[PDB]
């Protein structure tokens, strides 16, 4: 009888200046340059990754993607097998915004689409470590005791070390540099939506089609939607709106998850009337254990109530870098 909720684009391209303010621009107004277009009878599926209530992602193998006698693993984003046309719409929106933005090492970068003669696919880099969440928490006792045999994933076995925190701070930093840089709001940063491949990359991308969002209690309810209110920005729980400035703040908790070695945030505050309070009054998180205090000085900035004193991620960039040229032989 009527429509259900639908898939969206998760990241958001906006106007250049409205006035040291934003607008997004409608992702159906961008281009799409067919050259991305790859045979679907090319495509083998393979498992499913993550199965969400729009959707699933699925690791396939793509044959002659870039070099023809070659087979590569990618990761293949599609609705259900039920989605009509405008549903699928939003798919194509997601090919225009990654087409967009162009290609960096710590983004999942786009590879490939399957949109003409049958169910819109979107074919991307496939990150064979998977979500960082996930592996920060999986890799966590091997942090804790370097002799305890670490938690295998693939072909990694190796220990996880504060160099690897440094690493993946420095590469997420990297990652939304380069986004904002493109106009590009994530909104849901967050160490469940960064992933992990070979070299231990780390590479930002949206997982959440992959994801059911009413089973993770890291999305609340809040105003008909389900929100990570935990990751976000007062000024977005209050006014809706994201900004370069709260993908910060997100950027910030971030840091936390990380050198909590994937602790959910604020654990045990239920997300409630007084834990809007508390934040608006000013309380933040206190330094994980693990975090250096040059990392918590970020985060702490990254949590500014005024979001113009927030640090860019250009600086943050910055920031790391010098954390880790200093941290040399140190660690």
């Known amino acids: 009888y009527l429509q259900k909720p639908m898939y969206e684009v998760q990241w958001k391209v906006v106007e250049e200046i409205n006035g040291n303010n934003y607008v997004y621009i409608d992702p159906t107004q961008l281009p799409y340059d067919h050259k991305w277009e790859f045979p679907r009878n090319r495509l083998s599926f393979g498992k499913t990754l993550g199965a969400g209530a729009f959707g699933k992602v699925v690791e396939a193998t793509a044959y002659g993607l870039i070099k023809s006698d070659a087979a590569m693993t990618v990761a293949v984003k599609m609705l259900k097998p039920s989605a009509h046309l405008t549903e699928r719409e939003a798919l194509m929106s997601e090919l225009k915004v990654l087409s967009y933005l162009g290609n960096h090492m710590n983004i999942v970068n786009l590879l490939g689409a399957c949109t003409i003669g049958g169910p819109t696919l979107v074919i991307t880099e496939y990150c064979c470590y998977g979500d960082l969440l996930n592996f920060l928490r999986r890799k966590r006792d091997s942090f804790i005791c370097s002799k305890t045999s670490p938690a295998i994933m693939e072909d990694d076995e190796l220990a996880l070390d504060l160099e690897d925190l440094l690493s993946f701070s420095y590469q997420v930093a990297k990652g939304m540099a380069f986004l904002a840089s493109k106009n590009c709001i994530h909104r849901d940063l967050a160490a469940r939506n960064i992933l992990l491949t070979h070299g231990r990359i780390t590479k930002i991308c949206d997982f959440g089609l992959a994801r059911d969002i009413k089973n ?116």
Not at 277 to 287: A, C, H, T
């Open 216 to 331: 993770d209690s890291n999305y609340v309810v809040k105003g008909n939607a389900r929100l990570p209110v935990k990751w976000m920005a007062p000024e977005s729980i209050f006014n809706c709106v994201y900004t370069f400035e709260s993908d910060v703040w997100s950027y910030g908790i971030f840091l936390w998850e990380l050198f909590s070695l994937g602790s959910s945030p604020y654990p045990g505050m239920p997300v409630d009337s007084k834990f809007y309070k508390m934040i608006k009054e000013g309380f933040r998180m206190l330094s994980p254990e693990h975090a250096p205090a040059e990392m918590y000085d970020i985060m702490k900035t990254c949590w500014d109530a005024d979001p113009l004193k927030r640090p860019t991620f250009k600086q943050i960039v910055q920031l790391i870098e010098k954390q880790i040229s200093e941290s040399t032989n140190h660690i």
